[PDB]
Amino acid sequence: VRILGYDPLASPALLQVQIPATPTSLETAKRGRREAIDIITGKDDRVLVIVGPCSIHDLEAAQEYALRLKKLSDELKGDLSIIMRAYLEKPRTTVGWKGLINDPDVNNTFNINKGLQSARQLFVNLTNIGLPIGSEMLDTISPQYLADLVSFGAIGARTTESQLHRELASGLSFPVGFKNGTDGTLNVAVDACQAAAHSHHFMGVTKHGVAAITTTKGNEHCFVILRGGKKGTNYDAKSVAEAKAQLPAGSNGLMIDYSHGNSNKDFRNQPKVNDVVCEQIANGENAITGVMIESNINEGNQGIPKAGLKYGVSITDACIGWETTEDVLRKLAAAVRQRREVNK
Template sequence: MAFFIENKSVGQRGQAEDWRIRGYNPLTPPDLLQSEIPQTPESRVTVTKGRDEVVAVVNGTDEKNRLLVVVGPCSIHDPEAALAYCDLLLKAKEKHQDELVIVMRSYLEKPRTTVGWKGLVNDPDIDGTFKINKGLRVSRQLFVDLTHRGMPIASEMLDTISPQFLADVLSVGAIGARTTESQLHRELASGLSFPVGFKNGTDGSLGVAIDAIGAVQHPHHFLSVTKPGVVAIVGTVGNEDCFVILRGGTKGTNYDAESIKEAKAALEKKGVRQRLMVDCSHGNSLKNHKNQPKVAATLAEQIAQGEDAIMGVMIESNINEGNQKVPTEGKSGLKYGVSITDACIDWAETETVLDTLADAVKQRRKVQGASGVNGDA
């Protein structure tokens, strides 16, 4: 990778600083990119409606007591395929609009346990050139296109700068298992204009996620950049629309009825509303995408029996099943609609899972109606 400003002191250990820095490239200011790729009126309506619906579900005030479903690719590497997936999901969204609040999982940055492709923002050409300015441009255009079509989107927050380019088109945010305990990410979430989910730790511990929800409700200050790109101290007011995401961990899964019961008790003990999302992938699928429908079926069974704490489900889904490694020839050799990070279920399986979840919500309403429960929490 070439640098606009080469560091002539790289490798010179006698230097007091920067001897491990190869160089610098200028970053497009957020407001410049947002002005060049503005939201359309349709996009604004989608984002606002999506946020309002998600907030209602998270807080237990949705009049229809619907289930939030964040579903889509593990990560997006092909904008064209992402738009095609969106068109499929829009039909399902309309079909299940009375039972499910469907938001497309649209992850552009990937945290890596060691090394690997870091996502569309960081490496859009998937060749290690790290053309981040290009990645931000491609990503923003995709997000505007998705929301213009009428699809609200969710993405993971990995740093305090990229949200300045993209947060205006998001309806849901997520903080991953590796960063839930990070003070910086909690500070960031306290200032975001949409609900944010915190995953349990990689070992399966829920305490760090519950602590995060408590922390982000308060005002914070952290370092970031302004829309013109000037380094600044950001002050927030706090975010009360956050929730925990059960994703399993190294100690086992946590989507069964007993785990949900334990999670509810832990939330109640901390004075946090008993509303949670369950991730059907990652630790809960034992890292086998074929297990996701089984996890969803178990959740659907609990929902159908009247369990109201399960307010959301996350699913890793793509046009085609499985995943693939990037071939030696690069992007040109990739299979269409197949993940290059975690394996996903295909669209046909996704439709079946969504049908199952929607039926469970209908049954929950009947159970709650019979017992006089209105679904609010």
């Protein structure tokens, strides 16, 4: 009585034939995974940076952003391994635009087949210039359409406790970051990393678009992302110490989100978080192996009236602009270099 209807959906395999990855896309996605693994598992003393828009709504603006980020990445590659945020799926507090896949026209038409086409085309476009990408793995079905192109997955604060998302992460072929809970505590993310490291058996959709029983291997490349919350921000040295004390043997390095709960309702705080994180890194904190930054061409955000949208400005959370981003990243690279001196 509460299903209005079902509409046909192209299978993952069909979409993959229709929008093939280039060899460059595939190598880029592989390289991103390898570099991320090496950092979170302590093989490499560079910092892993997941940086880019809160959400993608415009392929052309995403491409411009990507070209700037790739240029900066080439310059800072001795110190930072950069993966672009290319987030397709947005968890809402209640309701709102859910992202490019769910409603690519941003006008409540919900053309999900077009959204999947736009998402896969975007992912090919970005990786094809040699820039690895990451996204929040919110939907448990959409990864089948896109995972060959992805180097990093986030499980959001609102889904870190969800057994379905822990199951999902246990079968993804790339590193996964679990955000702490929206209440600001990290136990649920530590628990999620534990759970996702195990094999799981569950029903899921295959590349052929049919439901089957999935058996996963477990994902040893899960790590905690500190993103603040109701209890307060958690990017500081005492919070980091508290996090380290909770991590089991075998744990990977920590990532600090400069945005969301750690920015206290304000994009202008992201450079302030960067300063505190840089201080810790430069003074020899080796457990901070990653950061996350919400960054766009231009700063701030805007409401949704698509033809009436301002260019290069977020339609979800407010972001720092490009110029601020470059400053933040250069400062972070300097801190990485200083950490090496302390470690020598």
